[PDB]
Nucleic acid binder design. Sequence first.
RNA 1: AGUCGC
Lengths: 490, 117, 73, 275, 46, 49, 51, 404, 67, 49
Amino acid sequence: KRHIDQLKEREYNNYSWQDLVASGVVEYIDTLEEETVMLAMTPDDLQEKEVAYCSTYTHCEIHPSMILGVCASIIPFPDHNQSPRNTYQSAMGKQAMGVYITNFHVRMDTLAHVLYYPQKPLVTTRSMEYLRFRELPAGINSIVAIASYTGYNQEDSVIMNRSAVDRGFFRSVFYRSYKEQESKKGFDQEEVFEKPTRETCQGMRHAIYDKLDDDGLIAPGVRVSGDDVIIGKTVTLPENEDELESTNRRYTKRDCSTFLRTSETGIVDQVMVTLNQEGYKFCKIRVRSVRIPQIGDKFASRHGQKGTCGIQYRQEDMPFTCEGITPDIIINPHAIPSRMTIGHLIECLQGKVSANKGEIGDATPFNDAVNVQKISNLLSDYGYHLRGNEVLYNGFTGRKITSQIFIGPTYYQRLKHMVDDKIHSRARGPIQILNRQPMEGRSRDGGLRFGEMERDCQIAHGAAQFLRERLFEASDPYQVHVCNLCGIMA
Amino acid sequence: MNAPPAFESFLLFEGEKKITINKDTKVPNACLFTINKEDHTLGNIIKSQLLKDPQVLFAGYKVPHPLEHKIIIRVQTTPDYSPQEAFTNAITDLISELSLLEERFRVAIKDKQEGIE
Amino acid sequence: LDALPRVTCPNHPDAILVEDYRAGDMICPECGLVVGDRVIDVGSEWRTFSNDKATKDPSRVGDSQNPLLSDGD
Amino acid sequence: MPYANQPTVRITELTDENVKFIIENTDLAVANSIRRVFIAEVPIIAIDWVQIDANSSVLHDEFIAHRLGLIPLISDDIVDKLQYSRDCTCEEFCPECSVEFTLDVRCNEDQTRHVTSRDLISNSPRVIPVTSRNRDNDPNDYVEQDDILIVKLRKGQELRLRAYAKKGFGKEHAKWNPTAGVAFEYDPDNALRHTVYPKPEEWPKSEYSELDEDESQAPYDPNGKPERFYYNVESCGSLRPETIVLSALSGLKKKLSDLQTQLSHEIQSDVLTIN
Amino acid sequence: QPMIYICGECHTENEIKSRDPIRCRECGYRIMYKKRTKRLVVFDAR
Amino acid sequence: FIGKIPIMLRSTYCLLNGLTDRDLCELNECPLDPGGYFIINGSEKVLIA
Amino acid sequence: MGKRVDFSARTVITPDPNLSIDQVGVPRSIAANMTFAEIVTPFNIDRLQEL
Amino acid sequence: VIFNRQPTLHKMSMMGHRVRILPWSTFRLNLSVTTPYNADFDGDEMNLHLPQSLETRAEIQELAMVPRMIVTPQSNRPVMGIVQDTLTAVRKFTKRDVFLERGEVMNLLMFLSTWDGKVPQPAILKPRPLWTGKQIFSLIIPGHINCIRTHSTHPDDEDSGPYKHISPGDTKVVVENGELIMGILCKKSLGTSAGSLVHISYLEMGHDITRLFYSNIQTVINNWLLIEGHTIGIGDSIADSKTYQDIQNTIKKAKQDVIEVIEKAHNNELEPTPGNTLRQTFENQVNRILNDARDKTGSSAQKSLSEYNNFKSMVVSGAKGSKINISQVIAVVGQQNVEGKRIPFGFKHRTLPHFIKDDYGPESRGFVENSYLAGLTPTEFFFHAMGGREGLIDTAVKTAETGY
Amino acid sequence: MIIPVRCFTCGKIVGNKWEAYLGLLQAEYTEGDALDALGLKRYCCRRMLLAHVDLIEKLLNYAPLEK
Amino acid sequence: RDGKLAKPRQLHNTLWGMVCPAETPEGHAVGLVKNLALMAYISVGSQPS
RNA sequence: AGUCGC
Ligand SMILES: [Mg+2]
Ligand SMILES: [Mg+2]
Ligand SMILES: [Zn+2]
Ligand SMILES: [Zn+2]
């Protein structure tokens, strides 16, 4: 413990972890060497020992919960969860949004999602302190009920308190940066940033060139949308090689300006003009968009329960309790038992006691705290049902619900993947020229593939006209003349 | 985006009407009232005032789909008494109870209290 | 039909021909009749890499080799 | 009519912050719907149009607009004098259907400035300001009453905008919640058995369960019905609690009377052919 | 006339409403953030 | 001079390696950014073990 | 044997109990963008003329 | 339109639906078709195709349309039956103790579809009007659909008890003339089981009226659910002092008995079973002891569950998860294992450096004593992750091979 | 970021209690008691103030409040 | 990559406090892409001389 | 390409 008193002293002294290694009280052990050591789990066990197990130990663990990697440490009580459940959380936690570094207002990152009101979790693991996760939170403490309420929330969806999303719950800002270069590029062809005009250029998609500034690129604060052309680049090209005037009009230069095909709405945040590594006049322009949590956006607790927001109700229709503290999320009770994610349930009860006591809660996995009964006991001292439930009234008809609903805080994450980006439809789009069949991605506004496997299914349906429609008349229909005397098309 | 403007939740549409009445043919003497742009706040109360009435055989309401502001009320009465009159009376009766509640409340506030305004 | 400096509106001589890229059609501003054989810039079209791999480019059925320096690659 | 169940009220306790009371001899649906009215249907005044002249703050524009949209407005003065944007004949906004605010601030000092609703000002006469000492030369002072904190600023940052508040109600957006909280409770001894306690001893008795001050816990009564509803309306301060209840009762009467008139209009205008 | 361009750090206007190089005068930076429109844009509080 | 080698961010050869919280906030770099990754043509490029 | 098709749509799915088993609820944007080719008859002509 | 999903494992994965226009941006689906698509709403995308002619619209309407994809020829039983939350609410609802006042019945009647319009007489007239649960259910069951048996939950007896004279017990499901006579409904009646109620509606009265019957049942039961509720909380995960002592004491008996088998093996007193080696015999014997321990203790935990418990109601209804999940949550997680056998000696003759060399005792090699509620000790935790990984990897590898 | 005006769950105004709160922690460290003196009884309003991180103070230190 | 079941995918015994037990992708690359433990460190190399 | 979604 005298070494500990020097470590407390470090607050105003040069003593450090290196000094600690210099006392020779800690050692570094690689995996090959770790095979030959006799390693006690915890000081406690190495102490009690007499004839309990053995006495030949040579090393001891500085703390057993250290076996976890960076993302696994966010997840509280990971040992009360079924093991693969922890693995899904490690993926999803990495997937959530929030604030990702503080100086983000001047970074031109290609794509970012920033949350409005991130909160540090009420329940935490001690490791989370070393992640500065108190500085850059990824989500919000919801008041949650595990109920069935309206059946909207079956099969991993969730009912949400719409007034809570209105009072600003889980709102986000979204940023996309579009970037463009003025290459000198060709032999005599040349690029210029400038406002195009239908009098003297080739191209002129029906989209509106009128929002462009006289500089050739839009300006901050102007509202943009799905067809707006944000930067006006032009390419003087033909030059004059087609003899004569070649003037009529629109003959001097082709259009290739850069326009919205990914951020189908927003505001211009910033427009930034500089010159890049090549020395060309170069541009980056950022658009901020705001995503309200809506039916289809995807969320998760920290114990690998992702689910979609299945509907949203007014704060009037949510079920309510005593004071009328109506829950922001209701996650369906059928979700817990088959996945056995019991740790999520401890977090409500730990969460209820921390918030209520006012002290932030410990949920570091391996301790002697016997943490289930004792958390329950604290909660009863505060005055709730000692094991968490509450009597919630039916929000519609004001009636009391026959049984009780389990409710309390839990950190929740709004994940990157949000409905408004995925939605897609095609009704005769562009056609690729190697196949004269429809495009592939949404980046080229494409159709979907009616795969080998989907085909096989229609045979089993015996709907041949529809199979014939889809693999032919709906995508790529063509007429050919063939000679009769010889089967060759020519 | 596809989300309605939030005011469209309660303003009547210019080509719509507030209530609509259609007969049911499955059983004699019965009616179906359509209340547009209304919710459980209204629907649930009218159900309870009608069930209070002893001439009413059946009364119930159902909101056909949550995303869709509209409620339907089925009411059925004895042949000797039109179901429409029970509904009109049930509202007026309800209007009377709330009016008496408002008068008693203001008077109760008027009771020796201070800082009432 | 060899006469088409983008001109092909049967009822009245063309004024301009606008490209409705997303619907994949060529439209004539003062009437309404399409004249399609849609190709919203064949250079955008080869970009049929997405979910498929891309920065080794299996879809690379066509190198560019920067010809505008030489006499011809 | 010869079956209408009177409804008697009783105020337990009242403050400028909350109003707590018990209703008796009424139906649960009445007790319920009235509750849904306190939340949704009491109209109020809140910012609805924000136009921003300048924003050099360390915050994006919509974010300033949002937080500002939630700032509480003293509608103690009858919102009834002031109309809705749609019914009011004028083009866009006007003095009779809207209230005008201006905020103009900049941080010139070498000290971090806080921007707070007191800096937002009513062009409108002082009958509809922000909830910050406009009426409180309160002897019960809390050495602050800063009302709210719109943003924070450092030297050289500026924020200039104008905003037009409107009457609207809670059914359209949460900013128009008149309530801070709205407690509702009935049958606190669970006599009616509307909820069923497994191991009924684990539950704590409520503040009204005292009637069985005895530990006997929840006596059954099978012939019972719901009676005696307990309320606790708490105001965010944008409107006096007593006034919230009274306006709610009126709004619900106006709403019902309108449905009756519409229904009357069903047989009066274009006579019904149900018979 | 895009004759604004707030600077990299000196924040002085740039007055480069033409083809000349975007070097801020007095101030060495050549990163030029672009000034807001005089245009009015409304945000509903919702 | 023989060539230019990329610097790993916030290593002792970065400019960031000695600076306190105040200088880094001044330079416009977040004090909480872990560093340790290259910047190549404006892209953050991290090597994988 | 499997090619991309036109008149096709994709979104995230969410549950709706108030829905019949063989109904599917579909977003306005997809309904307005998708089309069906009706043929005009001498009687529904008036309704199509309205559309 | 026909909507579908990938991968299209079988014909029921792609079916015709009628569009119904709604606000917001996602496809809404009637919860009950979730299973034949094998979707969730945990974030799954679906794709829709709109046919373009009257011939193809006719061909879909007549051939592929969902009320016609109900009983699959894949194994002549229904493809879809009542699922999830509704299924637990139907169990809870048909119990013989459920009673409804005139108001609640009128409200449920109002949500039904084919309702003739005649409120049935309540099973209790006096002292006050009361309708029983089964009774209201009988309005939903079509014209005269009639099953039998299909009681076979863990309620009543593994068969000889009911013959002890038809002390109705309360679990047989008898219906006649399309009217539910007695007994709780569940996975065995409503599920996709060959002998089920949904099977009899389709087979008896035709496809369409069955289609309206799925719609009709899900809607009525979900409203009742709204007043009833359903939840889960730590309250469901807790037994008592007596169960918990007996659980520990039974694990203590098993562990001591293993040490006896190790001592018999080290003493070389043991002999091999015919057809096997001594290690295989030792391993067969310790495995028989730790599983038998696990099952005895699980069966103890099943015995202790009160009837009010939310957790027991989901397993017994047959909504989600199984009896074994309750064991793991309440009593003991049990043995961990890779490729079938106990955790291999990844180190030199050890499993973790925390143990001593050669420790076949149940803890150093696999078997976790604690429950998910008590938490897993550090070593127990890591060995569990080894067992969970097998499950993650197998999903990916199996998916590719079946695909081919 | 900054403190959200009006607690998400129930609706009670709350931004007004932030500045008063930091003064309490300098005084009476009993976070429960400090929350209590501000009048945030019910725990949703309490988590609101209790869990928030005031990120704006770090953000203010970047030299340009003008971009 | 893409068609090969194997034992270098399954968490190995030696990964105790060396590489995170449960932080590897859920896709086809499962278990092949691992994530370093929190206390784990990696030797930088030195002359044996 | 890789990342990633189910
Ligand atoms: Mg799911
Ligand atoms: Mg999913
Ligand atoms: Zn004017
Ligand atoms: Zn058997």
